[PDB]
């Protein structure tokens, strides 16, 4: 029965149950041979210090197991416990049931707690033994069927997390707390079922009354958000039900579509769109859409998948700065997705951001040859102006890569344009502090008698730098 087998070895040890400081385990006792009898009884002398004693048991060099706690004035400590718990955890069904009933025939403690508050009900839930669960639920109270462990996992949470279905049905028929939440995570059994991808458990859970699909958690994520981990079956099971908040938002405002897009996998997004209820233009707390995430992460295949055959608005901008997703593609050196976005019919290349920022200006700043080639090929205006009216030639001069302005020289860009200050680009080129970036303009024979609003001239610009 259990771990008791003929020819094995038994060792015992004792410890102080201290809740503040680390204790020490005594040296293991002498070997005890195992024979026809299995369950022993230990006579414990009364402790001199009047403390509770924890008992540890080991079998022939296996991993030791805690078997009980004894009060100072308790004698004849029977080791019948920790075997009923092991019997309920037996992967086999008939053997476990026989061991359970034999140990219960001889006075086994149902209420004993092992493995951080896990009772026999938790062990039966993890193993999925339906017979012992039915026998326990036949005569039981609701206070023990809903008893959480140290981590907050009630038996229904363990049953849902292990993928078992029959025991979940048994607890549903008997009646247990369904919307119970764990500690520090506040995860319902639906969250655990969705995070792993079990369909039968989800169906059994939804068969019960008094259950909401849209239950939140610590960070505001619904089970539909957790269904992203499940590939196709659990998401379809979610979409098959009656009342689902498909566009549910978390604390930050993220939607399940946002999670599917940011994870870079299309089939889940297609399955979610199959419900014909997903709002593509859903925004975040900073007015960020799924297309913005795709542009900022370079997911070009998903970008093509979502941009075509769909009614999507590609002109949505973030509220703080009115900065579009094509600006995201331009930034962080994402040339291919930006080039694809430019050729799209429903994408505006001339869109402006806060401060009069155009995509061409950021392309010039980032020094991307391919994007500027697309700018020339498409036919976008080269003389775009900002609120402070720095020309693209000005930004090319100010950029860390001078070799841009050279190919801007042959495009007909005016080199005498001035900003709010009446200073030519050569005047501003001396102020930035770059040496080699100014030689490629000096050879063009640019005038040297221009005055700005404050009166300075190019010789003053190099005086403060040292070019």
């Amino acid at each position: 029965i259990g771990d008791w087998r003929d020819g094995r070895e038994v060792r015992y040890a004792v410890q102080y149950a201290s809740e503040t400081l680390f204790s020490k385990i005594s040296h293991w006792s002498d070997p005890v041979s195992v024979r026809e009898k299995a369950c022993p009884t230990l006579r414990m002398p009364v402790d001199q210090t009047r403390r509770n004693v924890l008992v540890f048991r080991k079998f022939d060099s296996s991993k030791p197991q805690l078997v009980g706690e004894i009060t100072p004035y308790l004698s004849n400590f029977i080791d019948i416990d920790r075997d009923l718990y092991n019997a309920a955890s037996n992967p086999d069904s008939a053997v476990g049931f026989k061991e359970f009933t034999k140990l219960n025939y001889d006075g086994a403690n149902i209420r004993a707690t092992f493995d951080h508050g896990r009772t026999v009900f938790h062990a039966a839930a993890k193993s999925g033994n339906d017979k012992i669960m039915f026998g326990l639920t036949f005569l039981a109270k609701s206070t023990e069927l809903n008893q959480p462990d140290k981590k907050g996992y009630t038996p229904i949470h363990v049953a849902a997390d292990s993928g078992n279905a029959g025991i979940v049905n048994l607890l549903i028929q008997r009646g247990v707390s369904i919307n119970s939440k764990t500690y520090h995570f506040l995860q319902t059994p639906l969250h655990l079922a969705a995070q792993r991808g079990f369909v039968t458990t989800f169906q059994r859970l939804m068969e019960s009354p008094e259950i909401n699909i849209n239950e939140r958690d610590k960070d505001g994520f619904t089970p539909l958000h957790y269904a992203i981990r499940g590939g196709e079956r659990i998401l379809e099971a979610f979409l098959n039900q009656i009342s689902i908040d498909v566009n549910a938002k978390s604390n930050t405002g993220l939607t399940p579509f946002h999670l599917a897009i940011i994870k870079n996998d299309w089939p889940v997004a297609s399955t979610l769109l199959g419900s014909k209820k997903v709002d593509i233009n859903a925004v975040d707390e900073n007015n960020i859409t799924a297309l913005h995430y795709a542009a900022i992460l370079g997911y070009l295949e998903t970008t093509k998948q979502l941009i075509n055959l769909k009614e999507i608005n590609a002109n949505v901008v973030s509220s703080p700065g009115l900065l579009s997703a094509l600006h995201y593609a331009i930034l962080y050196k994402h040339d291919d997705v930006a080039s694809f976005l430019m050729r799209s019919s429903n994408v505006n290349v001339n869109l402006k951001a806060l401060g009069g920022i155009t995509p061409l200006h950021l392309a010039v700043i980032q020094g991307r040859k391919q994007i500027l080639s697309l700018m020339f090929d498409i036919g976008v205006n080269i003389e775009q102006k900002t609120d402070e009216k720095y020309t693209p030639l000005h930004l090319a001069a100010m950029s860390k890569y001078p070799e841009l302005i050279q190919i801007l020289l042959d495009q007909g860009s005016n080199f005498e344009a001035k900003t709010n200050s009446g200073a030519t680009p050569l005047h501003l080129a001396t102020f930035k502090g770059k040496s080699q970036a100014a030689l490629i303009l000096l050879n063009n024979e640019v005038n040297w008698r221009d005055t700005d609003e404050n009166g300075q001239m190019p010789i003053h610009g190099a005086a403060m730098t040292g070019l």
């Binding site: 957790y226 930050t252 993220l254 900065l323 050196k333």
Partner: protein
Amino acid sequence: EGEDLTLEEKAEICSELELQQKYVDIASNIIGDLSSLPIAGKIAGTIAAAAMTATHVASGRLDIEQTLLGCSDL
């Protein structure tokens, strides 16, 4: 002007890679502001938290001077 001016030095901290690691630190300081990142990690991987942090940092007004010296990108 003022002799005790570090405008050139301030341009260097926006271009030095070591000071770009300091720009990571302020990006790393957003973990206190928003505590929803770890749960996003278990669902959409590690890249989810990085993407949210990047969007939060880059959502505001863009500065030309900061972008010129190269500490706007990372």
